[PDB]
Design a binder for this molecule. Structure first.
Ligand SMILES: CC(=O)N1c2ccc(-c3ccc(NC(=O)CCCCCCC(=O)NO)cc3)cc2[C@H](NC(=O)OC(C)C)C[C@@H]1C
Length: 127
């Protein structure tokens, strides 16, 4: 029933870089999604205590949210763009797994994912 610790956003043992693709992911992709009217439920880890969803972290074993992604991008946690893209995809997939089709939260996630894919289709090549 309690919340787990959030995903790691800092780790001195993990290798990291700044790439042009990761810069794009922060400045274009994350910025575009963050200001969407339906972004707010995804801006921090799912608080299963607040929501009284004691099964959330039984069903969802790889939690992810945009607050964590924003911290990882700003803290230069990632090695490459695919690590970040996978985090976004995990966030969407978790929502589709836990919730029913046609739930409001699923409609919200689908709106964000549509924008995400438009922006990722436009991902620049590596410098
Ligand atoms: C992502 C996901 O799958 N879920 C989820 C996750 C988080 C929340 C959620 C998130 C945040 C809060 N409230 C707060 O953090 C307090 C501040 C609210 C926002 C203030 C405005 C702002 O700062 N905007 O940027 C409550 C539920 C609700 C749902 C979903 N519940 C629900 O009623 O979602 C509606 C938004 C449709 C259930 C589900 C488990």
């Amino acid at each position: 029933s309690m919340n787990p610790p959030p995903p790691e956003t800092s780790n001195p043992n993990k290798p990291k870089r700044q790439t042009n693709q990761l810069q794009y992911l922060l400045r274009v992709v994350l910025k575009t999604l963050w200001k969407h009217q339906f972004a707010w439920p995804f801006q921090q880890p799912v608080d299963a205590v607040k929501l009284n969803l004691p099964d959330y972290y039984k069903i969802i074993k790889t939690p992810m949210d945009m607050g964590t992604i924003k911290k990882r991008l700003e803290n230069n946690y990632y090695w490459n763009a695919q690590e970040c893209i996978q985090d976004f995809n995990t966030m969407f997939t978790n929502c589709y797994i836990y919730n029913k089709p046609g739930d409001d939260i699923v409609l919200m996630a689908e709106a964000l994912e549509k924008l995400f894919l438009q922006k990722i289709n436009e991902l620049p090549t590596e410098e």
